[PDB]
CSV table of C-alpha atoms and ligand atoms in Angstrom, one decimal:
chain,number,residue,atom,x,y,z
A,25,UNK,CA,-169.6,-17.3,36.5
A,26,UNK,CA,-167.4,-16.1,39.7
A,27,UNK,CA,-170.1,-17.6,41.8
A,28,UNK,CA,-170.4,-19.6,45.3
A,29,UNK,CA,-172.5,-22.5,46.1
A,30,UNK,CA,-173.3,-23.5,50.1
A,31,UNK,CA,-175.2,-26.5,51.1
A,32,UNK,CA,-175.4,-28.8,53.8
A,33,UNK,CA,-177.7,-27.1,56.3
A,34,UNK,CA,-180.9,-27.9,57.9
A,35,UNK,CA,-182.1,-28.4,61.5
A,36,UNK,CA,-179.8,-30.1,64.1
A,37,UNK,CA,-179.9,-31.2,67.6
A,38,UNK,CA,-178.1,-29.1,70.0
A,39,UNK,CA,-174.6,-30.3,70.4
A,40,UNK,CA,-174.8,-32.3,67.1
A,41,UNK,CA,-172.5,-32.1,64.0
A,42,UNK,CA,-173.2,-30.5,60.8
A,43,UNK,CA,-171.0,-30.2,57.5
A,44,UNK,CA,-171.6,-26.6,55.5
A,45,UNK,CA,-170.2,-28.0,51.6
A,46,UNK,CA,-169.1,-24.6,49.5
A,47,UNK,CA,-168.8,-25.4,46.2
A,48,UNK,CA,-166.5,-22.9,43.3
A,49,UNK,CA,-165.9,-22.6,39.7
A,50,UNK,CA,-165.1,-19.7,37.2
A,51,UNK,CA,-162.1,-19.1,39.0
A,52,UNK,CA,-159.1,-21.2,39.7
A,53,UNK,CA,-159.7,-22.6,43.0
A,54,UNK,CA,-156.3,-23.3,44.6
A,55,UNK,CA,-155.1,-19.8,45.5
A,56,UNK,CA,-158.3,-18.3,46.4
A,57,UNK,CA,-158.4,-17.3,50.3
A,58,UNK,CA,-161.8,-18.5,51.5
A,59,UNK,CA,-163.9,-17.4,54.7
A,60,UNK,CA,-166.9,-18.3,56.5
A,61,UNK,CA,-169.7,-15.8,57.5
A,62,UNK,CA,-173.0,-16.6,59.7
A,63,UNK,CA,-175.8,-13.9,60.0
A,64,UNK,CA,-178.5,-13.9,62.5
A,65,UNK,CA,-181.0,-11.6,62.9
A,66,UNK,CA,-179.6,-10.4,66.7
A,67,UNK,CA,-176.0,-9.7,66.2
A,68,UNK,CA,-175.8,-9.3,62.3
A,69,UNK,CA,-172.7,-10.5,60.3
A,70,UNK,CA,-170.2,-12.3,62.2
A,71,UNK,CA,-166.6,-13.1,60.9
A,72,UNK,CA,-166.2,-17.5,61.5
A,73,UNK,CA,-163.2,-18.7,59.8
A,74,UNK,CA,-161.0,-18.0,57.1
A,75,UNK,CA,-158.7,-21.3,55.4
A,76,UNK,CA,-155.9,-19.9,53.0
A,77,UNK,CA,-153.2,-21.9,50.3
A,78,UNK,CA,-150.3,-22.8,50.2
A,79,UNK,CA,-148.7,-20.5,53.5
A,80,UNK,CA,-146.5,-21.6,55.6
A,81,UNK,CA,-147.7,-18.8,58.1
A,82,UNK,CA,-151.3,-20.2,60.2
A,83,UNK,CA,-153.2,-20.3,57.2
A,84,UNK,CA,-156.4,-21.3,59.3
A,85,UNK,CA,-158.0,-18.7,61.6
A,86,UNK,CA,-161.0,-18.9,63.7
A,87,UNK,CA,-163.1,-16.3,65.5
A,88,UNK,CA,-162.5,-16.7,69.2
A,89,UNK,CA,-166.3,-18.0,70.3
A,90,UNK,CA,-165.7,-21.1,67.5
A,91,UNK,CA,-162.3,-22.6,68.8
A,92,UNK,CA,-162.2,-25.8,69.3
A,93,UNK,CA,-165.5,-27.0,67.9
A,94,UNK,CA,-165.9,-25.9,64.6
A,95,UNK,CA,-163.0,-26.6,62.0
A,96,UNK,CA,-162.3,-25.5,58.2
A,97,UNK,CA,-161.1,-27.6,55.6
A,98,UNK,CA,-160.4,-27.5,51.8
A,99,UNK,CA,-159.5,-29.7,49.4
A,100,UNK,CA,-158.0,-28.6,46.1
A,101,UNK,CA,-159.2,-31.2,43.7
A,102,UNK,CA,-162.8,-30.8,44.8
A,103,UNK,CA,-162.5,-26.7,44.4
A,104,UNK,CA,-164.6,-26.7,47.8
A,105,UNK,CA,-164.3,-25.7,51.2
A,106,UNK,CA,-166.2,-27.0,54.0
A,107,UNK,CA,-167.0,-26.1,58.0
A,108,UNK,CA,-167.4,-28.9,60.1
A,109,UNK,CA,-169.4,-28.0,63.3
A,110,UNK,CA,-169.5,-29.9,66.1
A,111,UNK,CA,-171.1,-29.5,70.2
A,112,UNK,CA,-173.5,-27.2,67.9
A,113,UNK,CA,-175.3,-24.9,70.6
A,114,UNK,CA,-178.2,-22.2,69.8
A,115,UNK,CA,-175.4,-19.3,69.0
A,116,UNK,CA,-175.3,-21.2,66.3
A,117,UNK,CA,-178.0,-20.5,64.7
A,118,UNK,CA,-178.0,-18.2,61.3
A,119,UNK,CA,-177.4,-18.1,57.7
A,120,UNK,CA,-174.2,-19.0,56.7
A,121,UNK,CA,-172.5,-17.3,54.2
A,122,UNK,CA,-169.0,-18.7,51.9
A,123,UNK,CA,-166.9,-16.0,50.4
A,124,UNK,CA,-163.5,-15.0,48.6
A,125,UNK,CA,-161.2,-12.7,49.9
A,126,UNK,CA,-158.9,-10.4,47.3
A,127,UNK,CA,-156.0,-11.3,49.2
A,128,UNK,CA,-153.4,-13.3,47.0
A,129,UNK,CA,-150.5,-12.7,49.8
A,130,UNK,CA,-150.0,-12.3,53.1
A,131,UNK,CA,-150.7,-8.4,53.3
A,132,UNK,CA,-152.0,-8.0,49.9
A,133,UNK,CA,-153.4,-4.1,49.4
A,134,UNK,CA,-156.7,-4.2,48.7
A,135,UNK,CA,-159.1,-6.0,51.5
A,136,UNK,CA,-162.7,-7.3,51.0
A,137,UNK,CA,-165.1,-10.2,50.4
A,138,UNK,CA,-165.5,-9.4,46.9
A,139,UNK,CA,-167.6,-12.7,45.8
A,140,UNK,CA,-170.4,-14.2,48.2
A,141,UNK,CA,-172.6,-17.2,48.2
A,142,UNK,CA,-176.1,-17.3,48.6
A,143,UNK,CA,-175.7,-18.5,52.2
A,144,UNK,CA,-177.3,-22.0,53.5
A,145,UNK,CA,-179.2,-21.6,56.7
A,146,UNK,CA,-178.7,-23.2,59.9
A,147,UNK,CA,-181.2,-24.2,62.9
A,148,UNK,CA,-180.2,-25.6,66.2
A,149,UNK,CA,-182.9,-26.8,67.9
A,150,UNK,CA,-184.9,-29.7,70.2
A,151,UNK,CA,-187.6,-29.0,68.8
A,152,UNK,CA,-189.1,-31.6,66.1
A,153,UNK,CA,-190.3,-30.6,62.9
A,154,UNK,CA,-193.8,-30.0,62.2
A,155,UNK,CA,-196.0,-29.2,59.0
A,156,UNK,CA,-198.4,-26.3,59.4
A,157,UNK,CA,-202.0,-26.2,60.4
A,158,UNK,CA,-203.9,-23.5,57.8
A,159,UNK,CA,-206.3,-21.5,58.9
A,160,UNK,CA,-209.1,-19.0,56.6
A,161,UNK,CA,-209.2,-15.2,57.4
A,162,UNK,CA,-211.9,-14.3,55.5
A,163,UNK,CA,-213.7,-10.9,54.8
A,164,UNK,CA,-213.6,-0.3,47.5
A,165,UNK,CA,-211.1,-2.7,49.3
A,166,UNK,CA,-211.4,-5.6,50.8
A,167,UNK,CA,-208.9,-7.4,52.3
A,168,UNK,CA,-208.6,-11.7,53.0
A,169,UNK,CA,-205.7,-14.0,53.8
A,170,UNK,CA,-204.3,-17.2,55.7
A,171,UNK,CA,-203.0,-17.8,59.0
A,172,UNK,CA,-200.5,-20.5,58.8
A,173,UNK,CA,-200.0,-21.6,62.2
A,174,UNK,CA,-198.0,-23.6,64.4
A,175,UNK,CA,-194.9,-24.7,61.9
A,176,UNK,CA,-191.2,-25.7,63.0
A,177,UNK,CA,-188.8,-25.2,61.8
A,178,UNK,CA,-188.7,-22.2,59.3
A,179,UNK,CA,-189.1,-21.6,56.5
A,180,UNK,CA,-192.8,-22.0,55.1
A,181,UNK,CA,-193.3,-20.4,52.0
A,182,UNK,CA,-196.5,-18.8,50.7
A,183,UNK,CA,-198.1,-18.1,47.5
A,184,UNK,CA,-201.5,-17.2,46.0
A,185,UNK,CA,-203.2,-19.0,43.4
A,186,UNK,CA,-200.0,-20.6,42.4
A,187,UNK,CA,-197.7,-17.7,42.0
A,188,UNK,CA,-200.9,-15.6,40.6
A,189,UNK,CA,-201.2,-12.8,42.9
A,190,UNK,CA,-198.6,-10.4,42.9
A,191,UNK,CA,-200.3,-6.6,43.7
A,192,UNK,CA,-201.1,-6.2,47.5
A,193,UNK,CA,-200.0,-9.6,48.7
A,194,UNK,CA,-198.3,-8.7,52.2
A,195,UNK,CA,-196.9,-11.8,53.7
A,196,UNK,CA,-195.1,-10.9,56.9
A,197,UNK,CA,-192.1,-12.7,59.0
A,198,UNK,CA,-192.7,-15.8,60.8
A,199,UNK,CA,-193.1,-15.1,64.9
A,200,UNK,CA,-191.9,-17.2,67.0
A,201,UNK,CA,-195.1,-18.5,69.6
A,202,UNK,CA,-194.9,-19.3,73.6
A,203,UNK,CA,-195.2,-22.8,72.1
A,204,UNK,CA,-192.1,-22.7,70.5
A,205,UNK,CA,-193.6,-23.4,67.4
A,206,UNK,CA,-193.9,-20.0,64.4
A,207,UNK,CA,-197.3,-19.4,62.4
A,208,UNK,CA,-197.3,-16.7,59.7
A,209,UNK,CA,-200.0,-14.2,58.1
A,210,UNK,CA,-200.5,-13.6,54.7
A,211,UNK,CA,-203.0,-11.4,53.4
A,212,UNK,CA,-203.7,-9.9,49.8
A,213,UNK,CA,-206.1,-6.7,49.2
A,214,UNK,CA,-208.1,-7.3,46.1
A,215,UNK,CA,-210.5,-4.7,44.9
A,216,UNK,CA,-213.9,-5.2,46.6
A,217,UNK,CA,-215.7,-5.7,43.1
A,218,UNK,CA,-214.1,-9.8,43.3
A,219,UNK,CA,-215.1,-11.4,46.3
A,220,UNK,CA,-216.4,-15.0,46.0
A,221,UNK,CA,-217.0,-14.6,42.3
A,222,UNK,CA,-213.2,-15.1,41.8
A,223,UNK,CA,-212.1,-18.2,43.9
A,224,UNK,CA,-208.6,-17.1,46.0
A,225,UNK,CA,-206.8,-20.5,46.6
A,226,UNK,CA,-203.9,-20.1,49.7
A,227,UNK,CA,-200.8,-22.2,49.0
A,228,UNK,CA,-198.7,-23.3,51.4
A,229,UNK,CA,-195.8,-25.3,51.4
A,230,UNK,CA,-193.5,-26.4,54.3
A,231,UNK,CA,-190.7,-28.7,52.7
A,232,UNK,CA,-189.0,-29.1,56.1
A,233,UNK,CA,-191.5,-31.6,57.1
A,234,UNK,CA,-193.1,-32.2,53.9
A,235,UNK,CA,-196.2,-30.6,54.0
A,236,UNK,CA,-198.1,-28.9,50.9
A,237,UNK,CA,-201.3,-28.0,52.0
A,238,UNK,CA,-203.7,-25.7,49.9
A,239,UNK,CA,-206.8,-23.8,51.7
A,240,UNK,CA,-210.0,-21.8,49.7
A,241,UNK,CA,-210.6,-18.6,51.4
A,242,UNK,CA,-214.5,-17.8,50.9
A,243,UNK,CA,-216.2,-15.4,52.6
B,271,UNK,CA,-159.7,-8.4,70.4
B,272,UNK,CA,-161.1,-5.2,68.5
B,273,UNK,CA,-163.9,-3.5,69.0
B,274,UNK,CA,-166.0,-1.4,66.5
B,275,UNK,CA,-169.1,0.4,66.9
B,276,UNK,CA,-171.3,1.5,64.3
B,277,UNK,CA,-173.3,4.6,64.3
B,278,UNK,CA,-176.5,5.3,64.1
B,279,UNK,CA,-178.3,2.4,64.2
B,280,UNK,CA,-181.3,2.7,62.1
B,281,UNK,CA,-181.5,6.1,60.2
B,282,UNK,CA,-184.6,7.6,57.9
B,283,UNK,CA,-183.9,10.4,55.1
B,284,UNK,CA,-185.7,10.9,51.8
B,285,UNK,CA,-184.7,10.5,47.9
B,286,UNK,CA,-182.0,13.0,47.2
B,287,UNK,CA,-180.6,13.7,50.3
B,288,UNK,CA,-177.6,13.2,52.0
B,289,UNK,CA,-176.7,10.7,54.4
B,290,UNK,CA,-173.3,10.3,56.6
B,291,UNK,CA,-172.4,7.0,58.5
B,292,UNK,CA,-170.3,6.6,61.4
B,293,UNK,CA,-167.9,3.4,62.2
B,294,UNK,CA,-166.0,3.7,65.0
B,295,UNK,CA,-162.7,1.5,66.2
B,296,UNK,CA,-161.5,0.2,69.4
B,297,UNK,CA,-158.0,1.1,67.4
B,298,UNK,CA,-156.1,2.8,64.3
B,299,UNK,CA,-157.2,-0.1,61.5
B,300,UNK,CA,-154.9,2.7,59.9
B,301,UNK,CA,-157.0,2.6,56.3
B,302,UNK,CA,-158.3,-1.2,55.8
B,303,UNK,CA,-162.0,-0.7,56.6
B,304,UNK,CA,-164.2,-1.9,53.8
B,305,UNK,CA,-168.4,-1.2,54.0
B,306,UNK,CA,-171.3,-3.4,52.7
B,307,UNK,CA,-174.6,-2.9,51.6
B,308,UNK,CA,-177.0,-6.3,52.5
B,309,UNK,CA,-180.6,-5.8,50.7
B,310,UNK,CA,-183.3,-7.8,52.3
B,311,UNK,CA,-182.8,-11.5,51.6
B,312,UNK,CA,-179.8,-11.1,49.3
B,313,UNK,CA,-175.8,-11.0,50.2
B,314,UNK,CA,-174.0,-8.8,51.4
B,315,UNK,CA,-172.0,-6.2,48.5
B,316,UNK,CA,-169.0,-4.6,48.9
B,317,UNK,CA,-169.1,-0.6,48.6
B,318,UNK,CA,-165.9,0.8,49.5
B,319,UNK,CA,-162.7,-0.7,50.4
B,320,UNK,CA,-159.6,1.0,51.9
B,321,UNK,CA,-161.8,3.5,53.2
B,322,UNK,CA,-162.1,5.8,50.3
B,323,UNK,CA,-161.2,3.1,47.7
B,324,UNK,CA,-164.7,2.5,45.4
B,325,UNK,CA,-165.0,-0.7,43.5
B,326,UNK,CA,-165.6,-1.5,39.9
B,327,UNK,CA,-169.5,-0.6,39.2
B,328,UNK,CA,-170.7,0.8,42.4
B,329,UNK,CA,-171.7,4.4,41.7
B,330,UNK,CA,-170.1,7.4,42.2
B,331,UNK,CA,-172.6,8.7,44.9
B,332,UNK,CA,-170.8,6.2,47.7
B,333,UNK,CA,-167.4,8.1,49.0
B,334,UNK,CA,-165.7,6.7,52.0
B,335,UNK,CA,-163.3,9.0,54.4
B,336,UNK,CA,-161.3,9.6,57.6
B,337,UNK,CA,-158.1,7.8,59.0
B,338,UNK,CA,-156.9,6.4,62.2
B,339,UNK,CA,-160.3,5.5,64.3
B,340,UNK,CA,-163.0,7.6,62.6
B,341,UNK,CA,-164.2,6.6,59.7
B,342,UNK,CA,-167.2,7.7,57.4
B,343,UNK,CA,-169.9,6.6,54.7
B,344,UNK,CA,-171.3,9.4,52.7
B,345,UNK,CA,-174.2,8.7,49.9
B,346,UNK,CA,-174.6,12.3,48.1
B,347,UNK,CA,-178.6,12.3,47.1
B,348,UNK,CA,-180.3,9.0,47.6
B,349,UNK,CA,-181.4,7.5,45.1
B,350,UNK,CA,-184.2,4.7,45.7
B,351,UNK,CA,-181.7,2.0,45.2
B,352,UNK,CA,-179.6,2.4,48.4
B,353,UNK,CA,-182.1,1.3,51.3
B,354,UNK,CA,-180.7,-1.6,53.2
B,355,UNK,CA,-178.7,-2.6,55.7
B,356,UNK,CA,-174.8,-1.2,55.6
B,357,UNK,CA,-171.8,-2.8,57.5
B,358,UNK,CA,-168.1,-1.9,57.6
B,359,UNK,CA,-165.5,-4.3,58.5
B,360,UNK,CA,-161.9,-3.5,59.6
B,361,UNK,CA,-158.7,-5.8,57.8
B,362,UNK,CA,-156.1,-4.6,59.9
B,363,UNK,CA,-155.1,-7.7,61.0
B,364,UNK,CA,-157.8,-11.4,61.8
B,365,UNK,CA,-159.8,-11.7,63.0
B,366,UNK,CA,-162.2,-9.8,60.5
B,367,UNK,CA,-164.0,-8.3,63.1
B,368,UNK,CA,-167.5,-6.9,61.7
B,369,UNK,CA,-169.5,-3.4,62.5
B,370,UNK,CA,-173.2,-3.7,64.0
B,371,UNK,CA,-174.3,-2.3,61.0
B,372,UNK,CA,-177.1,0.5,60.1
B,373,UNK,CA,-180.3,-0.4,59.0
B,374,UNK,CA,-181.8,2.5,56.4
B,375,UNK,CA,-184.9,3.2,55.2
B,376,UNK,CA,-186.7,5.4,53.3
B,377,UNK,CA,-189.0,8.4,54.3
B,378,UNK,CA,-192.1,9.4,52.4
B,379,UNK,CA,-195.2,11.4,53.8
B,380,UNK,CA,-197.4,10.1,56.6
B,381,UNK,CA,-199.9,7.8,55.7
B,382,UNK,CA,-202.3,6.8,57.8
B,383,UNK,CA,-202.8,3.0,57.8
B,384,UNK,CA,-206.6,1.1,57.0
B,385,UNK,CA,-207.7,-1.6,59.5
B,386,UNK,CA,-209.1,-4.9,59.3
B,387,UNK,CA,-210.1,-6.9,61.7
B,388,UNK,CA,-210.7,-10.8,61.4
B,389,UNK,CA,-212.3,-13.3,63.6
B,390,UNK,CA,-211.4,-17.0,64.6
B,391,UNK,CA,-212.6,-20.0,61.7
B,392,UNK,CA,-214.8,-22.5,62.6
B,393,UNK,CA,-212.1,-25.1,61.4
B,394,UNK,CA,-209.4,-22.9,63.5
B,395,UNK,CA,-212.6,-23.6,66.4
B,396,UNK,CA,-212.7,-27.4,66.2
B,397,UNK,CA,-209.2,-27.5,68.0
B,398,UNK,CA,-209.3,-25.8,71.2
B,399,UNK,CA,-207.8,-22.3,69.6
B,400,UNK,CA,-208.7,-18.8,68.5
B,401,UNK,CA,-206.7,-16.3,67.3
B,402,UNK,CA,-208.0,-13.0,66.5
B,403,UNK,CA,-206.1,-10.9,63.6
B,404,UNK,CA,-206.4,-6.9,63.2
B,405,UNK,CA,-204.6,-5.7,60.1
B,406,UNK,CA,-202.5,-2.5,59.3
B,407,UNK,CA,-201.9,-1.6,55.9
B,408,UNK,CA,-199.6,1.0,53.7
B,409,UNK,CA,-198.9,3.5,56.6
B,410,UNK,CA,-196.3,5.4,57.5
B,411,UNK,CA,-194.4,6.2,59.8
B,412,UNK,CA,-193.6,2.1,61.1
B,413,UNK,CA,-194.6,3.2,64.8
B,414,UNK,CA,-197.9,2.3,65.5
B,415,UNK,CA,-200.2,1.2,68.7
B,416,UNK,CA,-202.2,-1.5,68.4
B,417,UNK,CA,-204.6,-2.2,71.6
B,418,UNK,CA,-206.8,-4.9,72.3
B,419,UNK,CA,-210.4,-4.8,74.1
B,420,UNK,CA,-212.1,-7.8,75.1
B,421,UNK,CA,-215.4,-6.3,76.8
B,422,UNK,CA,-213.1,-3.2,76.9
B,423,UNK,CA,-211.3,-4.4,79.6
B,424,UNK,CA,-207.7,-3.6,78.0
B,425,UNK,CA,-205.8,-6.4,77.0
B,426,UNK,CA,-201.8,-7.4,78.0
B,427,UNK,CA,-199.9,-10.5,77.4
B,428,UNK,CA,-201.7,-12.3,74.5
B,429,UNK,CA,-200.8,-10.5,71.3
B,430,UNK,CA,-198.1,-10.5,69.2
B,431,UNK,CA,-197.3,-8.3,66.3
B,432,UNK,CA,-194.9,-8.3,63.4
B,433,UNK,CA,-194.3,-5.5,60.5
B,434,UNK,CA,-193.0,-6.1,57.2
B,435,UNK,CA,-190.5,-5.1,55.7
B,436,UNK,CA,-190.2,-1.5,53.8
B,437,UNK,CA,-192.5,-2.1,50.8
B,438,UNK,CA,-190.7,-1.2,47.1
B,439,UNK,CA,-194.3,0.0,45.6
B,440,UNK,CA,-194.6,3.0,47.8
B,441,UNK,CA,-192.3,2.7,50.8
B,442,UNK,CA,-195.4,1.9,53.0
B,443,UNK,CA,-195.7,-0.5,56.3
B,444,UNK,CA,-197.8,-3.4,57.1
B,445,UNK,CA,-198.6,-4.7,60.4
B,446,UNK,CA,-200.7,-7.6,61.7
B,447,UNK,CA,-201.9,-8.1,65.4
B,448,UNK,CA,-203.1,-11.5,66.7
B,449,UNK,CA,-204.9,-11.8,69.9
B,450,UNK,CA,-204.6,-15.3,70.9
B,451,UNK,CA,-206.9,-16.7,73.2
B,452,UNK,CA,-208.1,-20.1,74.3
B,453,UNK,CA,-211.6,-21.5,72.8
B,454,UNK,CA,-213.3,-21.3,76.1
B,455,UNK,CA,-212.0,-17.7,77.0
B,456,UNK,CA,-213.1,-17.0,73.5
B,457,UNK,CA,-217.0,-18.1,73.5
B,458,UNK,CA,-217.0,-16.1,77.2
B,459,UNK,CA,-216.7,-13.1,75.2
B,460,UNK,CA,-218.2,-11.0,72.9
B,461,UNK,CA,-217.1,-7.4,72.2
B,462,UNK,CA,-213.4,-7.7,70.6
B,463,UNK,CA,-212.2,-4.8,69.6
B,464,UNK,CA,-209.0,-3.6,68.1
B,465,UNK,CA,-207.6,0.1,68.5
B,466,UNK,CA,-205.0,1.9,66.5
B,467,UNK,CA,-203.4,4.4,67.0
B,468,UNK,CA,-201.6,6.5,64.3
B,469,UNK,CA,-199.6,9.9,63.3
B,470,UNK,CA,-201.7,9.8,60.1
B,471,UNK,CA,-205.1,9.1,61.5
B,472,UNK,CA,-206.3,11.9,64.4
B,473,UNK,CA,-208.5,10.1,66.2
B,474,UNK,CA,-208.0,6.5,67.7
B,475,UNK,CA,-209.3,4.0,65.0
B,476,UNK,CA,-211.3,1.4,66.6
B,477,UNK,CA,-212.7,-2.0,64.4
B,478,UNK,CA,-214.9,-4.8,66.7
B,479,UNK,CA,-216.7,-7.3,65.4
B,480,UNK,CA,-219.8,-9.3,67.9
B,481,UNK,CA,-219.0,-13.1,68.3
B,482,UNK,CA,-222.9,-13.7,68.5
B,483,UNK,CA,-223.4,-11.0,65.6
C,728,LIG,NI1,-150.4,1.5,64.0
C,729,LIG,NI1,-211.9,-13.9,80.2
């Protein structure tokens, strides 16, 4: 039940505010050494903050590049931590992850993030939101899919048939456009003995923006 | 500040072998480097802390070694469950500086990839756009050339291309290419063709398809 729970991110203006909530139970809260780490797909995992209890020492560290604008806090009654980010820039950007150290004292043997959260992701963008235009790609075997195009922010998720199609379904990562704006391609190779007889419905679902959009494919 | 470089950076080896990983510091972290394994989409797990140190759980086929600035990652025979991405981190002293981290993958036999092409919808060409999608599926190796011919006049700064991720089923790739064009520049044309160009295959794969026909 040792388990972390992140929320609070979504898509923000540049230079806004945001408030990353990290929830905690199964283990008794008010001891626990808790740090912050973001992940982007450029630099990888990257160290934020850290917030310890009850130390007279600093207690609160920061990595160097979040000084100043972002700040940890914790309150013991609430078995929570939180990150409130401020003058938010396009760094920023990434999934956030809350996790427990295995440090009890100030130079405790035995170092690592042994408990992590699913992570809560972050965009910071001008860019306004926008649902997603879907478009047909149709045809031993054959092959068919969707182009979901023109979507902000991420993510869009895609299934087939309602969760039906499992074998051979390829959807691949979202590309960012000139536009600014991402489509996506997913495709699904079905043995060519099942074209039109067996109806292939495309669903796509943007929740950003609200969008749930379903498109045939027939050749 | 304190350094650390991570070495390599993407690596490919086969079920059973044996793989060694490098992680380098700007400084003697002395023994408090810990690694992580990160699995597409999921968190990060600890491996091995202290440097030689293994967790409860994690199998005995991880062992960690070295002292002062070198430090290595050693996985005796790969089994399929190990292909991710792998990060170590130094505790010496905050901040918790982290390692660039080594993407690894898995490497089966070549495989030469099938290819689809797919042309603009008519509801895609009520709105002024057309993309044009060629599909690559279940190859191996991930490098591949993918070419575009409109009129066979090669083609250069309209198409973008994205591969998945390192399939579970067989270890396999997946690419699609899409040739965006304008609707005008679209009904100009006639002859679009996609090349690919593959270890697996030994001649130059080409798939068109005639706007008119
Ligand atoms: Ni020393
Ligand atoms: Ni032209």
């Amino acid at each position: 039940e040792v388990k972390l729970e992140e929320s609070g991110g979504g898509l923000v203006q540049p230079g806004g505010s945001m408030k990353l909530s990290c929830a905690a139970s199964g283990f008794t809260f008010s001891d626990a050494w808790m740090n912050w780490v973001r992940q982007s797909p450029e630099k990888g995992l990257e160290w934020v903050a850290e917030i310890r209890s009850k130390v007279i020492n600093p207690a609160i560290y920061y990595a160097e590049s979040v000084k100043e604008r972002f700040t940890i806090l914790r309150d013991d009654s609430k078995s929570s931590v939180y990150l409130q980010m401020n003058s938010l820039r396009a760094e920023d950007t990434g999934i956030y992850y809350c996790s427990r150290s295995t440090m009890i004292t100030t130079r405790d043997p035995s170092r690592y993030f042994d408990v992590w959260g699913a992570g809560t992701t972050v965009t910071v963008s001008s860019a306004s939101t926008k649902g997603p235009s879907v478009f047909p790609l149709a045809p031993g075997t054959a092959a068919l899919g969707c182009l979901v195009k023109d979507y902000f922010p991420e993510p869009v998720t895609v299934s087939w048939n309602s969760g039906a199609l499992t074998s051979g379904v390829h959807t691949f990562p979202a590309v960012l456009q000139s536009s600014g704006l991402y489509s996506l391609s997913s495709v699904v190779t079905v043995p060519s003995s099942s074209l039109g007889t067996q109806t292939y419905i495309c669903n796509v679902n943007h929740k950003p923006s609200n969008t749930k959009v379903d498109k045939k494919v027939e050749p | 500040d304190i350094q650390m470089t991570q070495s390599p950076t993407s690596l490919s080896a086969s079920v059973g072998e044996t793989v060694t990983i490098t992680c380098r510091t700007s400084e003697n972290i002395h023994n408090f480097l810990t690694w992580y394994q990160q699995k597409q989409g999921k968190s990060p797990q600890v491996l091995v802390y202290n440097a030689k140190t293994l967790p409860d759980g994690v199998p005995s086929r991880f062992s960690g070694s070295g002292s002062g600035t070198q430090y290595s990652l050693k996985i005796n025979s790969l089994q399929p469950e190990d292909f991710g991405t792998y990060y170590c981190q130094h505790f010496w002293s905050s901040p918790w500086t982290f390692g660039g981290g080594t993407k690894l993958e898995i490497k089966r036999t070549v495989a030469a990839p099938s290819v689809f092409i797919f042309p603009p919808s008519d509801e895609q060409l009520k709105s002024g756009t057309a993309s044009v999608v060629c599909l690559l599926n279940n190859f191996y190796p991930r490098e591949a050339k993918v070419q575009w011919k409109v009129d066979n006049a090669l083609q250069s700064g309209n198409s973008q291309e994205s591969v998945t991720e390192q399939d579970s089923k067989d270890s396999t790739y997946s690419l699609s290419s899409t040739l965006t064009l304008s609707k005008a520049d679209y009904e100009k044309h006639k002859v679009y063709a996609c090349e690919v160009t593959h270890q697996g295959l030994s001649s130059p794969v080409t798939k068109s398809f005639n706007r008119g026909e």
